[PDB]
């Protein structure tokens, strides 16, 4: 999953898991 809500665009894909 992701740690936060929102659009999960390319930049914030380093946060998956």
């Amino acid at each position, epitope marked *: 999953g992701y740690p936060t809500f929102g659009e999960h*665009k*390319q930049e914030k894909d380093l946060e998956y898991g």
Partner: antibody
Amino acid sequence: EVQLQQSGAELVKPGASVKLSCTASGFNIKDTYIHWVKQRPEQGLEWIGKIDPANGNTKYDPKFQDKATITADTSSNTAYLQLSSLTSEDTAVYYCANSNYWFDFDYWGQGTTLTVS
Amino acid sequence: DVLMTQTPLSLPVSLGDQASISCRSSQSIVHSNGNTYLEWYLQKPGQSPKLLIYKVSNRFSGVPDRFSGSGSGTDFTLKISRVEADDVGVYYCYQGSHVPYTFGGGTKLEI
């Protein structure tokens, strides 16, 4: 890969509303940023805002906000910079940059010159 | 509002020479993720900007290895080991860490 096909030069009068078009090619427009970046001759490069057509979400530079209304024809894959109630500042070249599968944005439009007599 | 400036504003070099464009922000552009996401774009006359360098020192696919950035904090450097006539144009230094996002002043690299 990424191709952004912009409109050509248009020559208009003030107190008009003109929507500049930035056609996506080679991608669906809901997986990426649409940014608009302004460049006046009297300015460098100035980020306007961004639209993610995917769920309507926009983020603004407050300075140009609500002079610029950013919208998108979602299914036709074409993003639109509606520059409404013009002054002298609308006389500019606009560039349309597309989100990079990395961490920023890869390749820019072709330039849509809005000249205001 | 993070102000990114560049020096010089115009950098004359020879063919095959090494160019060094010095960029400096008004505030640290380190992202909350812990990474620095500093990009350099090349805009040629009559053309739109194109991505050459991202994440400081990462090279975009299709970009010659001649291009590489460096530095840290607020003071960063665009290094180009082999400047040719095909590398002529205006380079911009863009930070995507602080909203609203901001670009650099712009340096014209020329032969």
